Design a protein around this ligand. Structure first.
Ligand SMILES: [Zn+2]
Ligand SMILES: [Zn+2]
Ligand SMILES: [Zn+2]
Ligand SMILES: [Zn+2]
Ligand SMILES: [Zn+2]
Ligand SMILES: [Zn+2]
Ligand SMILES: [Zn+2]
Length: 275
């Protein structure tokens, strides 16, 4: 009635996992997880009680901050608390004039948009080799001058994510050299693309709940006209929603704002496996 509005803001932690597997030797697995924290602001609002009295401070705390190996806050929009009484959380103050400036500008440049996203934090999540990959991979090739056999073994890895959630739209793509004429063996079903000379398996979901507890194999045998094939990296895609790999969370400090939603998701970035 005479009260400072609560202002609606959305938050997102979006993380990307890059992994390289080599044969079945977990020691040579190389993992890099990057991420960003994005704040989204509803249309044009910008000032919703900013004049008299002053606009509410937008301040937030990142929970489980120590899980991040490296962090780069947006230098135009944020300052934070030093120290670093390493208490695992970190408080950030948003520069309100620079935010108002910023939210006015894109509103002029994306004027038909309902919402404006702002990159608040870019980061890298501490990883520990294969333990940190959500989908462990191992690939093996047998290259005959006249034939090629391919096996890919995968395992859903529970302990890579803060909460156990499914990997969605999982794709396994492998280019097959050597002039394939036909595939004479394949399991489970896959698609062979003659134009790009590569095979593709799609699995809708992979989790603890999956038919095999998320452990499985992909097998194919190819007949060649101009072999041998040379092993090429398997390239994998997947996305997941409802969890991060970091386990970081976000909370508001003081009044003025409410998180309409805090989205957490991760997806494979460059996610490869060599023979
Ligand atoms: Zn209002
Ligand atoms: Zn580093
Ligand atoms: Zn500041
Ligand atoms: Zn700082
Ligand atoms: Zn700007
Ligand atoms: Zn970005
Ligand atoms: Zn709290």
């Amino acid at each position: 009635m005479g009260a400072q509005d609560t202002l609606p803001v959305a938050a997102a932690f979006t993380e990307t996992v890059n992994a390289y597997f080599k044969g079945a030797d977990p020691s040579k697995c190389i993992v890099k997880i990057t991420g960003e924290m994005v704040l989204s602001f509803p249309a044009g609002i910008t000032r919703h009680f900013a004049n008299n009295p002053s606009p509410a401070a937008l301040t937030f705390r990142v929970i489980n901050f120590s899980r991040l190996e490296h962090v780069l806050p947006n230098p135009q929009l944020l300052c934070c608390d030093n120290t670093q009484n390493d208490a695992n959380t970190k408080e950030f103050w948003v520069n309100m004039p620079n935010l108002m400036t910023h939210l006015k500008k894109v509103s002029e440049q994306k004027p038909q948009a309902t919402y404006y996203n702002v990159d608040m934090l870019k980061y890298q999540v501490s990883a520990q080799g294969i333990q940190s990959t959500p989908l462990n991979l191992a690939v093996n090739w047998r290259c005959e001058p006249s034939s090629t056999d391919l096996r890919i073994d995968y395992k859903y890895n529970t302990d890579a994510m803060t909460t156990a959630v499914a990997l969605n739209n999982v794709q396994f793509l492998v280019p097959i050299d050597g002039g394939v004429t036909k595939l004479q063996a394949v399991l489970p079903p896959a698609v062979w693309n003659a134009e790009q000379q590569r095979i593709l398996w799609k699995i809708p979901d992979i989790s603890q709940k999956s038919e095999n507890g998320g452990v499985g194999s992909l097998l194919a045998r190819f007949q060649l006209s101009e072999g041998p094939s040379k092993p090429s990296p398997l390239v994998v895609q997947f996305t997941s929603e409802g969890s991060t790999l970091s386990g970081c969370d976000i909370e508001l400090v003081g009044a003025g704002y409410r998180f309409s939603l805090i989205k957490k998701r991760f997806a494979a970035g460059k996610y490869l496996a060599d023979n």
